[PDB]
Design a protein around this ligand. Structure first.
Ligand SMILES: [Mg+2]
Ligand SMILES: [Mg+2]
Ligand code: NA
Ligand code: NA
Lengths: 95, 95
DNA sequence: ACGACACGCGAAGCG
DNA sequence: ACGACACGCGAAGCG
């Protein structure tokens, strides 16, 4: 049996977000962070036509604590950093 | 409160797949298809290090019936086409 | 490829 | 930036 294809509608789905070291610290390179990636909610899917794109209508800022190791003369200094994630809460087909 | 960040592990998640008109018919252009996009399952996420990538271990072929209109001298001929989707069923960090 | 259907919505049917 | 911890796993603690 071949089922009718169903449209991937415009809505929030779980996507993989890579945590940017650049945003943790832009002025020093001597560090590691964990974890490297987290789940976020993002608007995806396809609208009726190509005059409209699937865009977020409301977004939820979400801070998360990542583990950080600064390497100083080959020894680790343990720190914590806060990364502010953005979740999409709702989407509509737009413009 | 800032919760500990949790790793987006290597596993299957729902992704948006655009249905390729090219695969429906490579030798004629005078047609439309519906729907334009469907949900599929795909391996995503991040492994421990960069010597390994998150790859599928088993995949499930899934045929779906899409609606097709061939436009012939400005009139529509209704047809059905079968698109074979590929779902990822399982993933592991690899190579 | 230039936004049928008594209409509006979706070789459709219902109201 | 060159794959601590009595070890192995994960300024850790448990077995
Ligand atoms: Mg009637
Ligand atoms: Mg001990
Ligand atoms: Na009609
Ligand atoms: Na230890």
């Amino acid at each position: 049996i071949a089922e009718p294809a169903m449209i991937a509608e415009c809505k929030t789905r779980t996507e993989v977000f890579e945590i940017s070291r650049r945003l943790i610290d832009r002025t020093n390179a001597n560090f590691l962070v964990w974890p490297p990636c987290v789940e976020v909610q993002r608007c995806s899917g396809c609208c009726n036509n190509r005059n409209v794109q699937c865009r977020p209508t409301q977004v939820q800022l979400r801070p998360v604590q990542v583990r950080k190791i600064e390497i100083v003369r080959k020894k680790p200094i343990f720190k914590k950093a806060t990364v502010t994630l953005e979740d999409h809460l709702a989407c509509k087909c737009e413009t």
